[PDB]
Design a binder for these strands. Sequence first.
RNA 1: GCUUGAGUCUCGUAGAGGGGGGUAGAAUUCCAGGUGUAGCGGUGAAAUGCGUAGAGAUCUGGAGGAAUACCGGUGGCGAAGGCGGCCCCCUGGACGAAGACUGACGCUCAGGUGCGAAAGCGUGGGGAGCAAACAGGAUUAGAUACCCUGGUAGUCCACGCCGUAAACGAUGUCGACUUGGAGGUUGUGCCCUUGAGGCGUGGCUUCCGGAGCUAACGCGUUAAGUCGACCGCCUGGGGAGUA
Lengths: 65, 65, 116, 88, 100, 271
Amino acid sequence: FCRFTAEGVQEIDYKDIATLKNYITESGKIVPSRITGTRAKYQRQLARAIKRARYLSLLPYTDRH
Amino acid sequence: IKVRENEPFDVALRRFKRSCEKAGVLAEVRRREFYEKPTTERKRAKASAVKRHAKKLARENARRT
Amino acid sequence: RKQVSDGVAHIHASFNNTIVTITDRQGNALGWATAGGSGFRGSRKSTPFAAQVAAERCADAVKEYGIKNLEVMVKGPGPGRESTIRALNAAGFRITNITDVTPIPHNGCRPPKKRR
Amino acid sequence: SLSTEATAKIVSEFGRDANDTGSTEVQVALLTAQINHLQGHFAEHKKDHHSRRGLLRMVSQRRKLLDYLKRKDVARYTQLIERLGLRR
Amino acid sequence: MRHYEIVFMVHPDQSEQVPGMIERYTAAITGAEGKIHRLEDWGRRQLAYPINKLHKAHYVLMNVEAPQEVIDELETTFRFNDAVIRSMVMRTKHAVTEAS
Amino acid sequence: AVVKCKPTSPGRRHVVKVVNPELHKGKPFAPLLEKNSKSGGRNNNGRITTRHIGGGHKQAYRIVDFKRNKDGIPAVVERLEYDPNRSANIALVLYKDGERRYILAPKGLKAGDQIQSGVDAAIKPGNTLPMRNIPVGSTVHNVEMKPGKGGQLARSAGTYVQIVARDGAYVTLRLRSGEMRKVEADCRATLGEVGNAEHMLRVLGKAGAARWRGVRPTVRGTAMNPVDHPHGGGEGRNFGKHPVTPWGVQTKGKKTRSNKRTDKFIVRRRS
RNA sequence: GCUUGAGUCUCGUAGAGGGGGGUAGAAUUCCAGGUGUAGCGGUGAAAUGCGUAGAGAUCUGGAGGAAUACCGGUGGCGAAGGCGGCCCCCUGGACGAAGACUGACGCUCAGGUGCGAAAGCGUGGGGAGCAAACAGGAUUAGAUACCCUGGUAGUCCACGCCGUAAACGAUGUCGACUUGGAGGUUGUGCCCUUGAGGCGUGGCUUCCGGAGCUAACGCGUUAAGUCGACCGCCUGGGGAGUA
């Protein structure tokens, strides 16, 4: 409930998978904003950062890989 | 989805199935494209959720109990 | 017969039937049993007790392989999937890990329209 | 598109200076320069109907400004349509 | 001159030619008046999913500024090269600051 | 482009022209021409061996270089021309050393554009280069069967062959009919589709438009006597027979593929 | 002439706005091979269907097409229809801040012109899944239906035509005015970033309700209140959106 990208400052980078793996669940799905608490601007950046890191094989699409 | 439950466990308790995929997003895809009711029943899901939100806080009456 | 040591228990639970197939580490099968192949034809096939006897009747015909610990891969919805894995404990196996290999698409081809 | 480099080149060519940016003859040339730019965009693609509507918003706005200009001062009008090349 | 980022992965047994390849493309852009800014070479690391299976590819980040005709002649080079596996190109906005 | 004629007379009512304005409108390049004499369907023995051909307009053979044996020389496409022997158009191609040759004109090729052949050549549409250097998946045309043979496959108008797979020293080609077929990996191919893809839309309007293409009338089997065709005869349009050729072999279904010498190179038959 | 309407410029801000190309992954289907064996599939119950010529299950590899799970939200964009993977290219609009400029250039619009879901048509492709029609099996008094097993057009793409929908907030477009509350979303200024705050200010949006209106239901500052400007339309039910 204490949104992390609105707290300091951010544009959600796709390369730093350290913070980016905090916002995926165990099966590779993106966690909704009602759970984490991110602002909706930082949620649209996040999904575009998950999917672009899922492209470059940094994060997985699913756990069936 | 996937659970390992390191060698002394004695019981499965796969609780991430009710949290990820098991029958929620699978009974939804077993039939019925609809193309139309994900506009209609998504509306009625949240039309009743806001009457679960507003009418629950203002339910404070005497009611003899 | 080769005396395989650890195997994989693919459990394909459907609404109509539960098929339980025991493979090996490579993934080629060593014996299977269904809810329909154990009697239980028709309405009793779609029951959790029928997957239980499909689990015990898959525990033999791999008695000639000597499988000790097995990794579970349940797949699909239905009345099995949860009472068959309690019957693989009761058959005398070790459960290494359980997964869920339900083939969920990412909004792929159109499903059918039925049940009206 | 009408970049900042291209916008300032037409304001000084048709107005007092770069400060006089909203004059009547300036706006006609700015709408003309973008319509003549978008002839290349709609030479291909041929079905961009949502951007065609923006093109017709600025054809018709240029038609109303030139018709304001012809009523307001005819002398400044006949300068412009020969200088900018749009009359039969 | 729009800015770019170019993350291309490399087929891993041909990773010796990568400083040959980083030189190969930064000659095409600086040679055609385009500034390179962050050659953050990530090295070899592990993949999340198999990619023709081929585990553990080799990552190169560029972050170039370049005219658009050059960055398209660059991107048709990544197709025909058999060493580049899954490149991508991105938005301008800026240059970056090594962003590990 | 695709011009529909106005019905000013019968016959002109159903004409569709395929009008290319980029074609050359002069007498063609005279050193690369030699004569083409009509056969009529007749051989050594003089007897008609292919029916329904004969007549037509006189047409001179354009020596078209399918083989593309000019490795690593720049070549500027001079002008697109009409070849009556083909369905496709041909491009007059000037090399840098001063030699002109005809090639088939691909889809995007215009006058002034540059092609070249050889293994060094780029993957620009129009270049000829061997298939062990062509990328997998890309679309080629003017495909060779044997190395140095010249080019056999995908050389009609609009036709192309997509390259499917490369398993060792063979290239798996999906032919235009839908047939998967292996060739030698050292055979050449020209990239891109063949131009004049609106050739399929010409519908010729009238009966005389096929007579000046050499195609003579086809007489049906049922209109003949029983001595002439294995159909034929009968009082008033009797057929009652399984359909056959004029020499008795079953048509409409009967497969005539029996070679056994080239069945190694075929992966899938035509479906 | 003037500037409070409208407009132009300079910096930014969000967006499934639009067209063009490319690519990614999961799944379905089919083919090819390995293992393996008598069932699978389906239903309220069955049967047709499939399968010892070895299916189903399972593994690997291949070929194709179409759609984008999670994000995802009475959330966002667009004039409406509508638009969801990520990427690049070419573009439209809206909004905000500070100014500077034009000087009423405006609003509505019969006829006209453009756009316009889906189904349909035309020509050329593509065809995985789904699926009218059609065949078979069931259910039934009947069942040319729901249910089951199959399956053609079609959905797909390029280019034309059609011009219709419960094309619906059943609510024309534009402007001004008249108590509030809780939210969302996108800017922006002040103040302590002083610790995930405190205060103004704009645009869009959802819900509840005050006067007022309404036949009532209800709308209720994105009015169905108080007014103005133009336009479209209505005149008992059928017959008839028919000849």
